[PDB]
Design an enzyme around this catalytic site. Sequence first.
Site, PDB file in Angstrom:
ATOM      1  N   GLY A  22     -19.984  33.751 -38.038  1.00 48.74           N
ATOM      2  CA  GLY A  22     -20.235  32.446 -37.510  1.00 48.74           C
ATOM      3  C   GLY A  22     -21.059  32.281 -36.406  1.00 48.74           C
ATOM      4  O   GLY A  22     -21.541  33.479 -35.755  1.00 48.74           O
ATOM      5  N   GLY A  24     -21.645  29.396 -32.846  1.00 50.68           N
ATOM      6  CA  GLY A  24     -21.199  28.982 -31.600  1.00 50.68           C
ATOM      7  C   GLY A  24     -21.682  29.701 -30.349  1.00 50.68           C
ATOM      8  O   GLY A  24     -22.748  30.609 -30.572  1.00 50.68           O
ATOM      9  N   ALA A  25     -21.217  29.783 -29.327  1.00 48.45           N
ATOM     10  CA  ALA A  25     -21.595  30.809 -28.140  1.00 48.45           C
ATOM     11  C   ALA A  25     -23.202  30.722 -28.074  1.00 48.45           C
ATOM     12  O   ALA A  25     -23.849  29.449 -28.053  1.00 48.45           O
ATOM     13  CB  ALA A  25     -21.107  31.893 -28.399  1.00 48.45           C
ATOM     14  N   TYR A  26     -23.703  31.550 -27.662  1.00 49.68           N
ATOM     15  CA  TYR A  26     -25.214  31.828 -27.571  1.00 49.68           C
ATOM     16  C   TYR A  26     -25.466  32.509 -28.843  1.00 49.68           C
ATOM     17  O   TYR A  26     -26.445  33.184 -29.093  1.00 49.68           O
ATOM     18  CB  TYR A  26     -25.652  32.812 -26.419  1.00 49.68           C
ATOM     19  N   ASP A 139     -11.048  23.151 -21.671  1.00 46.04           N
ATOM     20  CA  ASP A 139     -11.447  22.822 -23.156  1.00 46.04           C
ATOM     21  C   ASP A 139     -10.679  23.246 -24.138  1.00 46.04           C
ATOM     22  O   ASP A 139     -10.849  23.929 -24.953  1.00 46.04           O
ATOM     23  CB  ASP A 139     -12.954  23.538 -23.208  1.00 46.04           C
TER      24      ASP A 139
END
EC number: 2.7.11.24
Length: 338
Positions: A22, A24-26, A139
């Site tokens: 997947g 997300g993140a950078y 978060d």
Amino acid sequence: PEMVRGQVFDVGPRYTNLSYIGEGAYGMVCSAYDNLNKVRVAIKKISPFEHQTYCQRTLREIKILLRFRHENIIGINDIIRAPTIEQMKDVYIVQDLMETDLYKLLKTQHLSNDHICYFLYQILRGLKYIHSANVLHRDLKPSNLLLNTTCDLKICDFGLARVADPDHDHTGFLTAAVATRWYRAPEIMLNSKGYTKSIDIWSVGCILAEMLSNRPIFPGKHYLDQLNHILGILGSPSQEDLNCIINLKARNYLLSLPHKNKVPWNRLFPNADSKALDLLDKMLTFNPHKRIEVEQALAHPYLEQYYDPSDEPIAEAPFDLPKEKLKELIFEETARFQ
Ligand SMILES: N#Cc1c[nH]c2ncccc12
């Protein structure tokens, strides 16, 4: 190198067999076969060096995860970067491979009270450690909680973690923002920059409710809608809760609102363990000062069958830049894996 989807994933030779998992993140996350440990691992690729904020979140996270060692916190087994700062484009964080996360799990499964109790326990066990190192996650949400095939839970994503700063917590009405809206404590939208540990508990409180019903309990569609959601269930805060809000814009917003009575949890969750609803109650308390703390949450009767302070460790010790030095600190911080 190897290519995933359509992008370079330069983690040879040790990490092979790269399946796309997947974003997300950078960006990209992949499974890969760790040849040295003969096990599949998760690898996330980070290309943060274009803007400072990503260099910050990447740095914060790497700094924290390296220092932490806990069964219920994710941890970093390896980092793959180029051998020179000049050649460093990407950072590859290597972590344990986890079957799913609580977000995906909630979308598809009804949890038993035993899975709920055990999931909650693990969250709180991990949270206790984090807080004892004087760090806030800030978060916590079901997608930041990863489960393996045996229902072992691990907190992940310390991108937005700060060091606790309750003295510096106050701010104005509606000052915003950043953590996932659904899990934001009500005082974020009123008078808090979210620098107290009470902020995480609220989130865990929201996670607990979500585990009871497979639905987010406060799905506000926008900033201020979140607050009327919360208020809709908990009721208008009392005189004493309001007085703790010295900021006049916030206090007068609250006063301008019509009286809403408390909805009892047993009505919102008719099938839940009543011990769970009691703990739920203490976590989703409007007044953050009256909100339960992680170690009292652990000692709550609902968790009685897992609660064991000698098996709930604390950290052995606690805890504004250009992206240039950031890239340089990231390099220095990732050096021990070269
Ligand atoms: N980021 C991240 C992950 C770290 N371990 C993982 N296992 C399955 C899916 C994602 C991850």
